[PDB]
């Protein structure tokens, strides 16, 4: 009973404009949590976080206000960022990328199902727990696109340019779901080639023009096997209304290709 509410801040997990994130350890139980410290947008992040409950979404335990400073208690992910599992210019083994992509789809399906769009999917925002289970992180740019079963079209510029869908730069209004599908396709590209295909998806970007002209003999596409590449051809489609939806990604051949063995379990012989 005494001291269970006490947490020691043992190290910095992240720093930025928002403030900082510290790894906190319970004085009594030694449970590890991530505490987001915002100097003080944050009201919306907390409200969205209160809605979330899924195995592939960073869990929100609660918040505390100490005058001006807000403390967000979040699920600690000991495996760090997916970003650091991507070898520059190489990527990672295709069965690992497939497993992470399955868990990313489960997370995004969940959020879209409750009418939430993350709006900044990228490997820095995809964390790994002790068993390498992927968790969608940081709902600071997230918003509600569906309420009372009515879709709201988005118009605000949100995200990170290499991961943003082309409609965000070309259209005044756009559907939220194809934008998250697109960023997931860029994450899959990064996992399989260890590089981003373009600085941004605009016609003034030579690499983006090459892709629309189907020059897949060029990098990063040359490093990707034909089966995951065929999926990327359906995701990285400029027209968001013609882009593949998640129910159709779940039917894709590479998505359902057996590649990955289960977690290595202890065994003996004779
Ligand atoms: C001491 O470090 C380690 O042992 C390995 C490590 C490194 C970076 C992160 C984590 C773990 N885990 C997080 O849960 C984590 C939690 C939060 C976070 N950043 C956020 C920023 C803003 N909002 C939410 C999360 C990054 C994170 N990455």
PDB file of C-alpha atoms and ligand atoms in Angstrom:
ATOM      1  CA  UNK A   1       0.000   0.000   0.000  1.00  0.00           C
ATOM      2  CA  UNK A   2       2.608   2.774   0.890  1.00  0.00           C
ATOM      3  CA  UNK A   3       4.949   4.238  -1.842  1.00  0.00           C
ATOM      4  CA  UNK A   4       3.134   2.382  -4.788  1.00  0.00           C
ATOM      5  CA  UNK A   5       2.325   5.836  -6.317  1.00  0.00           C
ATOM      6  CA  UNK A   6       6.076   6.746  -6.422  1.00  0.00           C
ATOM      7  CA  UNK A   7       8.014   6.511  -9.693  1.00  0.00           C
ATOM      8  CA  UNK A   8      11.715   7.210 -10.217  1.00  0.00           C
ATOM      9  CA  UNK A   9      12.622   8.890 -13.557  1.00  0.00           C
ATOM     10  CA  UNK A  10      15.651   6.770 -14.564  1.00  0.00           C
ATOM     11  CA  UNK A  11      16.387   7.970 -18.217  1.00  0.00           C
ATOM     12  CA  UNK A  12      15.280  10.117 -21.197  1.00  0.00           C
ATOM     13  CA  UNK A  13      13.498   8.140 -23.940  1.00  0.00           C
ATOM     14  CA  UNK A  14      12.809  11.142 -26.201  1.00  0.00           C
ATOM     15  CA  UNK A  15      13.105  14.961 -26.414  1.00  0.00           C
ATOM     16  CA  UNK A  16      11.320  17.492 -28.623  1.00  0.00           C
ATOM     17  CA  UNK A  17       9.046  20.555 -29.027  1.00  0.00           C
ATOM     18  CA  UNK A  18       6.261  18.736 -27.038  1.00  0.00           C
ATOM     19  CA  UNK A  19       8.678  18.419 -24.064  1.00  0.00           C
ATOM     20  CA  UNK A  20      10.271  15.109 -22.978  1.00  0.00           C
ATOM     21  CA  UNK A  21       9.538  11.409 -22.320  1.00  0.00           C
ATOM     22  CA  UNK A  22      11.139   9.673 -19.326  1.00  0.00           C
ATOM     23  CA  UNK A  23      11.382   5.989 -18.459  1.00  0.00           C
ATOM     24  CA  UNK A  24       9.800   5.678 -14.970  1.00  0.00           C
ATOM     25  CA  UNK A  25      10.291   2.757 -12.574  1.00  0.00           C
ATOM     26  CA  UNK A  26       7.882   2.095  -9.684  1.00  0.00           C
ATOM     27  CA  UNK A  27       9.642   2.427  -6.279  1.00  0.00           C
ATOM     28  CA  UNK A  28       7.698  -0.606  -4.891  1.00  0.00           C
ATOM     29  CA  UNK A  29       6.796  -2.938  -7.824  1.00  0.00           C
ATOM     30  CA  UNK A  30       9.682  -1.928 -10.240  1.00  0.00           C
ATOM     31  CA  UNK A  31       7.071  -1.775 -13.085  1.00  0.00           C
ATOM     32  CA  UNK A  32       8.411   0.253 -16.052  1.00  0.00           C
ATOM     33  CA  UNK A  33       6.269   3.010 -17.651  1.00  0.00           C
ATOM     34  CA  UNK A  34       6.927   5.888 -20.072  1.00  0.00           C
ATOM     35  CA  UNK A  35       6.004   9.326 -18.703  1.00  0.00           C
ATOM     36  CA  UNK A  36       5.372  12.104 -21.219  1.00  0.00           C
ATOM     37  CA  UNK A  37       6.176  15.471 -19.585  1.00  0.00           C
ATOM     38  CA  UNK A  38       4.495  18.416 -21.403  1.00  0.00           C
ATOM     39  CA  UNK A  39       5.573  21.968 -20.277  1.00  0.00           C
ATOM     40  CA  UNK A  40       2.192  23.483 -21.498  1.00  0.00           C
ATOM     41  CA  UNK A  41      -3.429  20.179 -28.110  1.00  0.00           C
ATOM     42  CA  UNK A  42      -2.424  18.169 -24.989  1.00  0.00           C
ATOM     43  CA  UNK A  43      -6.150  18.028 -23.953  1.00  0.00           C
ATOM     44  CA  UNK A  44      -6.981  16.387 -27.329  1.00  0.00           C
ATOM     45  CA  UNK A  45      -4.005  13.904 -27.078  1.00  0.00           C
ATOM     46  CA  UNK A  46      -5.211  12.760 -23.593  1.00  0.00           C
ATOM     47  CA  UNK A  47      -8.878  12.539 -24.753  1.00  0.00           C
ATOM     48  CA  UNK A  48      -7.873  10.449 -27.845  1.00  0.00           C
ATOM     49  CA  UNK A  49      -5.530   8.262 -25.669  1.00  0.00           C
ATOM     50  CA  UNK A  50      -8.465   7.558 -23.239  1.00  0.00           C
ATOM     51  CA  UNK A  51     -10.371   5.961 -26.180  1.00  0.00           C
ATOM     52  CA  UNK A  52      -7.533   3.485 -27.090  1.00  0.00           C
ATOM     53  CA  UNK A  53      -7.316  -0.167 -26.049  1.00  0.00           C
ATOM     54  CA  UNK A  54      -5.496  -2.489 -28.463  1.00  0.00           C
ATOM     55  CA  UNK A  55      -2.447  -4.822 -28.311  1.00  0.00           C
ATOM     56  CA  UNK A  56      -0.749  -2.821 -31.179  1.00  0.00           C
ATOM     57  CA  UNK A  57      -1.405   0.670 -29.716  1.00  0.00           C
ATOM     58  CA  UNK A  58       0.660   2.159 -26.847  1.00  0.00           C
ATOM     59  CA  UNK A  59      -1.606   1.845 -23.774  1.00  0.00           C
ATOM     60  CA  UNK A  60      -2.588   4.961 -21.777  1.00  0.00           C
ATOM     61  CA  UNK A  61      -2.738   4.407 -17.976  1.00  0.00           C
ATOM     62  CA  UNK A  62      -3.762   7.970 -17.051  1.00  0.00           C
ATOM     63  CA  UNK A  63      -2.542  11.538 -16.535  1.00  0.00           C
ATOM     64  CA  UNK A  64      -1.697  13.952 -13.677  1.00  0.00           C
ATOM     65  CA  UNK A  65      -1.496  17.764 -13.638  1.00  0.00           C
ATOM     66  CA  UNK A  66       1.052  19.498 -11.346  1.00  0.00           C
ATOM     67  CA  UNK A  67       0.212  23.153 -12.027  1.00  0.00           C
ATOM     68  CA  UNK A  68       1.537  23.968 -15.513  1.00  0.00           C
ATOM     69  CA  UNK A  69       3.234  20.556 -16.205  1.00  0.00           C
ATOM     70  CA  UNK A  70       1.147  17.559 -17.536  1.00  0.00           C
ATOM     71  CA  UNK A  71       2.309  13.934 -16.942  1.00  0.00           C
ATOM     72  CA  UNK A  72       1.061  11.281 -19.402  1.00  0.00           C
ATOM     73  CA  UNK A  73       1.558   7.694 -18.182  1.00  0.00           C
ATOM     74  CA  UNK A  74       2.112   5.384 -21.140  1.00  0.00           C
ATOM     75  CA  UNK A  75       2.970   1.743 -21.801  1.00  0.00           C
ATOM     76  CA  UNK A  76       6.751   1.297 -21.859  1.00  0.00           C
ATOM     77  CA  UNK A  77       8.111  -0.472 -24.936  1.00  0.00           C
ATOM     78  CA  UNK A  78      11.582  -1.902 -24.065  1.00  0.00           C
ATOM     79  CA  UNK A  79      12.483  -2.796 -27.712  1.00  0.00           C
ATOM     80  CA  UNK A  80      12.705   0.887 -28.669  1.00  0.00           C
ATOM     81  CA  UNK A  81      11.813   2.217 -32.127  1.00  0.00           C
ATOM     82  CA  UNK A  82      11.222   0.185 -35.334  1.00  0.00           C
ATOM     83  CA  UNK A  83      13.478   2.875 -36.904  1.00  0.00           C
ATOM     84  CA  UNK A  84      16.573   1.233 -35.245  1.00  0.00           C
ATOM     85  CA  UNK A  85      15.665  -2.248 -36.635  1.00  0.00           C
ATOM     86  CA  UNK A  86      16.049  -0.845 -40.203  1.00  0.00           C
ATOM     87  CA  UNK A  87      19.650  -1.219 -41.461  1.00  0.00           C
ATOM     88  CA  UNK A  88      20.463   1.849 -43.659  1.00  0.00           C
ATOM     89  CA  UNK A  89      20.393   0.934 -47.399  1.00  0.00           C
ATOM     90  CA  UNK A  90      19.523  -2.752 -46.511  1.00  0.00           C
ATOM     91  CA  UNK A  91      16.316  -2.854 -44.437  1.00  0.00           C
ATOM     92  CA  UNK A  92      15.607  -6.087 -42.534  1.00  0.00           C
ATOM     93  CA  UNK A  93      14.768  -9.780 -43.269  1.00  0.00           C
ATOM     94  CA  UNK A  94      11.511  -9.946 -45.284  1.00  0.00           C
ATOM     95  CA  UNK A  95       9.769 -12.305 -42.692  1.00  0.00           C
ATOM     96  CA  UNK A  96      10.461  -9.681 -39.915  1.00  0.00           C
ATOM     97  CA  UNK A  97       9.076  -6.831 -42.143  1.00  0.00           C
ATOM     98  CA  UNK A  98       5.970  -8.957 -42.925  1.00  0.00           C
ATOM     99  CA  UNK A  99       5.299  -9.654 -39.205  1.00  0.00           C
ATOM    100  CA  UNK A 100       5.741  -5.926 -38.333  1.00  0.00           C
ATOM    101  CA  UNK A 101       3.479  -4.981 -41.284  1.00  0.00           C
ATOM    102  CA  UNK A 102       0.741  -7.459 -40.057  1.00  0.00           C
ATOM    103  CA  UNK A 103       0.898  -5.870 -36.537  1.00  0.00           C
ATOM    104  CA  UNK A 104       0.888  -2.333 -38.079  1.00  0.00           C
ATOM    105  CA  UNK A 105      -2.305  -3.237 -40.075  1.00  0.00           C
ATOM    106  CA  UNK A 106      -3.984  -4.646 -36.893  1.00  0.00           C
ATOM    107  CA  UNK A 107      -3.205  -1.348 -35.096  1.00  0.00           C
ATOM    108  CA  UNK A 108      -4.403   0.919 -37.985  1.00  0.00           C
ATOM    109  CA  UNK A 109      -7.612  -1.275 -38.554  1.00  0.00           C
ATOM    110  CA  UNK A 110      -8.384  -0.736 -34.849  1.00  0.00           C
ATOM    111  CA  UNK A 111      -7.845   3.074 -34.910  1.00  0.00           C
ATOM    112  CA  UNK A 112      -9.822   3.533 -38.144  1.00  0.00           C
ATOM    113  CA  UNK A 113     -12.589   1.309 -36.674  1.00  0.00           C
ATOM    114  CA  UNK A 114     -12.996   3.708 -33.724  1.00  0.00           C
ATOM    115  CA  UNK A 115     -12.790   6.678 -36.165  1.00  0.00           C
ATOM    116  CA  UNK A 116      -9.237   7.764 -35.227  1.00  0.00           C
ATOM    117  CA  UNK A 117      -6.455   8.692 -37.687  1.00  0.00           C
ATOM    118  CA  UNK A 118      -2.865   8.836 -36.308  1.00  0.00           C
ATOM    119  CA  UNK A 119      -1.699  11.130 -39.222  1.00  0.00           C
ATOM    120  CA  UNK A 120       2.080  10.607 -38.601  1.00  0.00           C
ATOM    121  CA  UNK A 121       2.853   6.908 -39.140  1.00  0.00           C
ATOM    122  CA  UNK A 122       6.624   6.419 -39.532  1.00  0.00           C
ATOM    123  CA  UNK A 123       9.232   4.026 -37.978  1.00  0.00           C
ATOM    124  CA  UNK A 124      10.054   6.540 -35.146  1.00  0.00           C
ATOM    125  CA  UNK A 125       6.393   6.281 -34.015  1.00  0.00           C
ATOM    126  CA  UNK A 126       6.317   2.481 -34.129  1.00  0.00           C
ATOM    127  CA  UNK A 127       7.676   1.032 -30.885  1.00  0.00           C
ATOM    128  CA  UNK A 128       8.569  -2.519 -29.932  1.00  0.00           C
ATOM    129  CA  UNK A 129       7.858  -4.284 -26.616  1.00  0.00           C
ATOM    130  CA  UNK A 130      10.108  -7.010 -24.992  1.00  0.00           C
ATOM    131  CA  UNK A 131       8.679  -9.618 -27.486  1.00  0.00           C
ATOM    132  CA  UNK A 132       9.185  -7.297 -30.578  1.00  0.00           C
ATOM    133  CA  UNK A 133       5.387  -6.612 -30.719  1.00  0.00           C
ATOM    134  CA  UNK A 134       4.746  -3.395 -32.641  1.00  0.00           C
ATOM    135  CA  UNK A 135       2.869  -0.561 -30.875  1.00  0.00           C
ATOM    136  CA  UNK A 136       1.578   2.612 -32.549  1.00  0.00           C
ATOM    137  CA  UNK A 137       2.932   5.604 -30.591  1.00  0.00           C
ATOM    138  CA  UNK A 138       2.349   9.396 -30.104  1.00  0.00           C
ATOM    139  CA  UNK A 139      -1.248  10.598 -30.692  1.00  0.00           C
ATOM    140  CA  UNK A 140      -0.164  14.238 -30.596  1.00  0.00           C
ATOM    141  CA  UNK A 141      -1.133  14.742 -34.284  1.00  0.00           C
ATOM    142  CA  UNK A 142      -4.119  12.302 -34.176  1.00  0.00           C
ATOM    143  CA  UNK A 143      -7.722  13.419 -34.809  1.00  0.00           C
ATOM    144  CA  UNK A 144     -11.322  12.079 -35.052  1.00  0.00           C
ATOM    145  CA  UNK A 145     -12.352  11.583 -38.725  1.00  0.00           C
ATOM    146  CA  UNK A 146     -15.603   9.644 -37.962  1.00  0.00           C
ATOM    147  CA  UNK A 147     -18.185  10.574 -35.365  1.00  0.00           C
ATOM    148  CA  UNK A 148     -21.830   9.430 -34.988  1.00  0.00           C
ATOM    149  CA  UNK A 149     -21.088   7.252 -38.072  1.00  0.00           C
ATOM    150  CA  UNK A 150     -20.437  10.448 -40.173  1.00  0.00           C
ATOM    151  CA  UNK A 151     -17.096  10.882 -41.891  1.00  0.00           C
ATOM    152  CA  UNK A 152     -15.359  14.236 -41.671  1.00  0.00           C
ATOM    153  CA  UNK A 153     -13.018  15.113 -44.566  1.00  0.00           C
ATOM    154  CA  UNK A 154      -9.645  16.458 -43.424  1.00  0.00           C
ATOM    155  CA  UNK A 155      -7.858  19.626 -44.675  1.00  0.00           C
ATOM    156  CA  UNK A 156      -4.974  20.287 -42.224  1.00  0.00           C
ATOM    157  CA  UNK A 157      -1.345  19.652 -43.283  1.00  0.00           C
ATOM    158  CA  UNK A 158      -0.109  16.987 -40.844  1.00  0.00           C
ATOM    159  CA  UNK A 159       2.649  14.393 -40.896  1.00  0.00           C
ATOM    160  CA  UNK A 160       6.248  14.038 -42.127  1.00  0.00           C
ATOM    161  CA  UNK A 161       6.908  14.874 -45.837  1.00  0.00           C
ATOM    162  CA  UNK A 162       8.590  11.541 -46.956  1.00  0.00           C
ATOM    163  CA  UNK A 163       5.571   9.591 -45.490  1.00  0.00           C
ATOM    164  CA  UNK A 164       2.730  11.966 -46.561  1.00  0.00           C
ATOM    165  CA  UNK A 165       0.216  10.914 -49.252  1.00  0.00           C
ATOM    166  CA  UNK A 166       0.281  13.077 -52.446  1.00  0.00           C
ATOM    167  CA  UNK A 167      -3.375  14.280 -51.991  1.00  0.00           C
ATOM    168  CA  UNK A 168      -2.274  16.224 -48.814  1.00  0.00           C
ATOM    169  CA  UNK A 169      -0.040  18.411 -51.013  1.00  0.00           C
ATOM    170  CA  UNK A 170      -2.478  18.647 -53.981  1.00  0.00           C
ATOM    171  CA  UNK A 171      -6.038  18.806 -52.596  1.00  0.00           C
ATOM    172  CA  UNK A 172      -7.808  21.155 -50.195  1.00  0.00           C
ATOM    173  CA  UNK A 173      -9.778  18.182 -48.689  1.00  0.00           C
ATOM    174  CA  UNK A 174      -9.036  14.461 -48.418  1.00  0.00           C
ATOM    175  CA  UNK A 175     -10.229  11.215 -46.817  1.00  0.00           C
ATOM    176  CA  UNK A 176      -8.252  10.319 -43.635  1.00  0.00           C
ATOM    177  CA  UNK A 177      -7.930   6.500 -44.151  1.00  0.00           C
ATOM    178  CA  UNK A 178      -6.061   6.419 -47.548  1.00  0.00           C
ATOM    179  CA  UNK A 179      -3.506   8.878 -46.013  1.00  0.00           C
ATOM    180  CA  UNK A 180      -2.615   6.365 -43.199  1.00  0.00           C
ATOM    181  CA  UNK A 181      -2.584   3.471 -45.782  1.00  0.00           C
ATOM    182  CA  UNK A 182       0.011   5.470 -47.844  1.00  0.00           C
ATOM    183  CA  UNK A 183       2.345   6.159 -44.828  1.00  0.00           C
ATOM    184  CA  UNK A 184       2.114   2.398 -43.992  1.00  0.00           C
ATOM    185  CA  UNK A 185       3.309   1.703 -47.569  1.00  0.00           C
ATOM    186  CA  UNK A 186       6.317   4.058 -47.051  1.00  0.00           C
ATOM    187  CA  UNK A 187       7.083   2.278 -43.721  1.00  0.00           C
ATOM    188  CA  UNK A 188       6.948  -1.093 -45.589  1.00  0.00           C
ATOM    189  CA  UNK A 189       9.298   0.358 -48.308  1.00  0.00           C
ATOM    190  CA  UNK A 190      11.764   1.523 -45.527  1.00  0.00           C
ATOM    191  CA  UNK A 191      11.640  -1.918 -43.852  1.00  0.00           C
ATOM    192  CA  UNK A 192      12.450  -3.762 -47.110  1.00  0.00           C
ATOM    193  CA  UNK A 193      15.033  -1.367 -48.672  1.00  0.00           C
ATOM    194  CA  UNK A 194      16.459   0.632 -45.741  1.00  0.00           C
ATOM    195  CA  UNK A 195      15.762   3.929 -47.563  1.00  0.00           C
ATOM    196  CA  UNK A 196      12.907   6.324 -48.300  1.00  0.00           C
ATOM    197  CA  UNK A 197      11.856   6.503 -51.988  1.00  0.00           C
ATOM    198  CA  UNK A 198      11.460  10.372 -52.123  1.00  0.00           C
ATOM    199  CA  UNK A 199      11.752  13.612 -50.051  1.00  0.00           C
ATOM    200  CA  UNK A 200       7.996  14.172 -50.824  1.00  0.00           C
ATOM    201  CA  UNK A 201       5.364  12.773 -53.286  1.00  0.00           C
ATOM    202  CA  UNK A 202       5.267  15.633 -55.823  1.00  0.00           C
ATOM    203  CA  UNK A 203       5.775  15.665 -59.658  1.00  0.00           C
ATOM    204  CA  UNK A 204       8.781  18.059 -59.134  1.00  0.00           C
ATOM    205  CA  UNK A 205      10.442  15.099 -57.246  1.00  0.00           C
ATOM    206  CA  UNK A 206      12.357  13.014 -59.888  1.00  0.00           C
ATOM    207  CA  UNK A 207      12.171   9.828 -57.693  1.00  0.00           C
ATOM    208  CA  UNK A 208       8.399  10.216 -57.382  1.00  0.00           C
ATOM    209  CA  UNK A 209       8.063  10.741 -61.202  1.00  0.00           C
ATOM    210  CA  UNK A 210      10.223   7.594 -61.828  1.00  0.00           C
ATOM    211  CA  UNK A 211       7.872   5.479 -59.627  1.00  0.00           C
ATOM    212  CA  UNK A 212       4.701   6.755 -61.416  1.00  0.00           C
ATOM    213  CA  UNK A 213       6.542   5.829 -64.702  1.00  0.00           C
ATOM    214  CA  UNK A 214       7.109   2.311 -63.144  1.00  0.00           C
ATOM    215  CA  UNK A 215      10.964   2.432 -63.223  1.00  0.00           C
ATOM    216  CA  UNK A 216      11.299  -0.365 -60.622  1.00  0.00           C
ATOM    217  CA  UNK A 217      14.876  -1.266 -61.851  1.00  0.00           C
ATOM    218  CA  UNK A 218      15.940   1.814 -59.818  1.00  0.00           C
ATOM    219  CA  UNK A 219      16.462   2.059 -56.004  1.00  0.00           C
ATOM    220  CA  UNK A 220      14.698   1.439 -53.587  1.00  0.00           C
ATOM    221  CA  UNK A 221      12.400  -0.829 -55.732  1.00  0.00           C
ATOM    222  CA  UNK A 222      15.294  -2.974 -57.166  1.00  0.00           C
ATOM    223  CA  UNK A 223      16.042  -4.295 -53.619  1.00  0.00           C
ATOM    224  CA  UNK A 224      12.407  -5.443 -53.057  1.00  0.00           C
ATOM    225  CA  UNK A 225      11.142  -8.917 -54.112  1.00  0.00           C
ATOM    226  CA  UNK A 226       8.324  -9.014 -56.731  1.00  0.00           C
ATOM    227  CA  UNK A 227       5.590 -10.209 -54.238  1.00  0.00           C
ATOM    228  CA  UNK A 228       5.959  -7.310 -51.617  1.00  0.00           C
ATOM    229  CA  UNK A 229       6.653  -4.903 -54.592  1.00  0.00           C
ATOM    230  CA  UNK A 230       3.259  -5.866 -56.132  1.00  0.00           C
ATOM    231  CA  UNK A 231       1.628  -4.882 -52.817  1.00  0.00           C
ATOM    232  CA  UNK A 232       3.549  -1.538 -52.826  1.00  0.00           C
ATOM    233  CA  UNK A 233       2.263  -0.930 -56.456  1.00  0.00           C
ATOM    234  CA  UNK A 234      -1.300  -1.073 -55.012  1.00  0.00           C
ATOM    235  CA  UNK A 235      -0.541   1.092 -51.878  1.00  0.00           C
ATOM    236  CA  UNK A 236       1.580   3.854 -53.442  1.00  0.00           C
ATOM    237  CA  UNK A 237      -1.185   4.814 -55.914  1.00  0.00           C
ATOM    238  CA  UNK A 238      -1.434   8.624 -56.413  1.00  0.00           C
ATOM    239  CA  UNK A 239      -5.269   8.673 -56.647  1.00  0.00           C
ATOM    240  CA  UNK A 240      -6.521   8.037 -53.030  1.00  0.00           C
ATOM    241  CA  UNK A 241      -9.934   6.760 -54.346  1.00  0.00           C
ATOM    242  CA  UNK A 242      -8.115   4.070 -56.446  1.00  0.00           C
ATOM    243  CA  UNK A 243      -5.575   3.227 -53.661  1.00  0.00           C
ATOM    244  CA  UNK A 244      -5.967  -0.224 -52.011  1.00  0.00           C
ATOM    245  CA  UNK A 245      -7.996  -0.276 -48.764  1.00  0.00           C
ATOM    246  CA  UNK A 246      -6.886  -2.245 -45.694  1.00  0.00           C
ATOM    247  CA  UNK A 247      -9.570  -5.051 -46.211  1.00  0.00           C
ATOM    248  CA  UNK A 248      -7.969  -5.565 -49.672  1.00  0.00           C
ATOM    249  CA  UNK A 249      -4.359  -5.413 -48.241  1.00  0.00           C
ATOM    250  CA  UNK A 250      -5.423  -8.419 -46.028  1.00  0.00           C
ATOM    251  CA  UNK A 251      -6.215 -10.351 -49.280  1.00  0.00           C
ATOM    252  CA  UNK A 252      -2.887  -9.457 -50.992  1.00  0.00           C
ATOM    253  CA  UNK A 253      -0.676 -12.462 -51.948  1.00  0.00           C
ATOM    254  CA  UNK A 254       2.561 -11.327 -50.186  1.00  0.00           C
ATOM    255  CA  UNK A 255       0.530 -10.252 -47.070  1.00  0.00           C
ATOM    256  CA  UNK A 256      -0.677 -13.909 -46.823  1.00  0.00           C
ATOM    257  CA  UNK A 257       2.643 -15.528 -47.948  1.00  0.00           C
ATOM    258  CA  UNK A 258       4.082 -17.946 -45.301  1.00  0.00           C
ATOM    259  CA  UNK A 259       7.564 -16.625 -44.517  1.00  0.00           C
ATOM    260  CA  UNK A 260       8.007 -16.331 -40.756  1.00  0.00           C
ATOM    261  CA  UNK A 261       8.602 -19.018 -38.128  1.00  0.00           C
ATOM    262  CA  UNK A 262       7.094 -18.415 -34.662  1.00  0.00           C
ATOM    263  CA  UNK A 263       9.179 -17.065 -31.729  1.00  0.00           C
ATOM    264  CA  UNK A 264      12.092 -19.510 -31.052  1.00  0.00           C
ATOM    265  CA  UNK A 265      10.814 -21.837 -28.262  1.00  0.00           C
ATOM    266  CA  UNK A 266      13.240 -23.919 -26.071  1.00  0.00           C
ATOM    267  CA  UNK A 267      13.714 -27.557 -27.216  1.00  0.00           C
ATOM    268  CA  UNK A 268      15.844 -30.676 -26.426  1.00  0.00           C
ATOM    269  CA  UNK A 269      16.659 -33.867 -28.410  1.00  0.00           C
ATOM    270  CA  UNK A 270      16.581 -37.689 -27.689  1.00  0.00           C
TER     271      UNK A 270
HETATM  272  C1  LIG B   1      16.202   3.637 -22.374  1.00  0.00           C
HETATM  273  O1  LIG B   1      15.792   3.245 -23.705  1.00  0.00           O
HETATM  274  C2  LIG B   1      15.659   1.942 -23.945  1.00  0.00           C
HETATM  275  O2  LIG B   1      15.879   1.087 -23.128  1.00  0.00           O
HETATM  276  C3  LIG B   1      15.209   1.700 -25.358  1.00  0.00           C
HETATM  277  C4  LIG B   1      14.151   2.680 -25.813  1.00  0.00           C
HETATM  278  C5  LIG B   1      14.482   3.771 -26.604  1.00  0.00           C
HETATM  279  C6  LIG B   1      13.503   4.601 -27.125  1.00  0.00           C
HETATM  280  C7  LIG B   1      12.157   4.351 -26.860  1.00  0.00           C
HETATM  281  C8  LIG B   1      11.811   3.290 -26.016  1.00  0.00           C
HETATM  282  C9  LIG B   1      12.812   2.466 -25.506  1.00  0.00           C
HETATM  283  N1  LIG B   1      10.486   3.014 -25.613  1.00  0.00           N
HETATM  284  C10 LIG B   1       9.369   3.753 -25.461  1.00  0.00           C
HETATM  285  O3  LIG B   1       8.363   3.256 -24.951  1.00  0.00           O
HETATM  286  C11 LIG B   1       9.345   5.187 -25.897  1.00  0.00           C
HETATM  287  C12 LIG B   1       8.360   5.982 -25.311  1.00  0.00           C
HETATM  288  C13 LIG B   1       8.067   7.241 -25.798  1.00  0.00           C
HETATM  289  C14 LIG B   1       8.759   7.747 -26.889  1.00  0.00           C
HETATM  290  N2  LIG B   1       8.433   8.995 -27.476  1.00  0.00           N
HETATM  291  C15 LIG B   1       7.191   9.672 -27.526  1.00  0.00           C
HETATM  292  C16 LIG B   1       7.185  11.032 -27.808  1.00  0.00           C
HETATM  293  C17 LIG B   1       5.974  11.701 -27.777  1.00  0.00           C
HETATM  294  N3  LIG B   1       4.805  11.116 -27.485  1.00  0.00           N
HETATM  295  C18 LIG B   1       4.831   9.805 -27.235  1.00  0.00           C
HETATM  296  C19 LIG B   1       5.982   9.039 -27.263  1.00  0.00           C
HETATM  297  C20 LIG B   1       9.787   6.996 -27.447  1.00  0.00           C
HETATM  298  C21 LIG B   1      10.100   5.730 -26.960  1.00  0.00           C
HETATM  299  N4  LIG B   1      11.190   5.084 -27.575  1.00  0.00           N
END
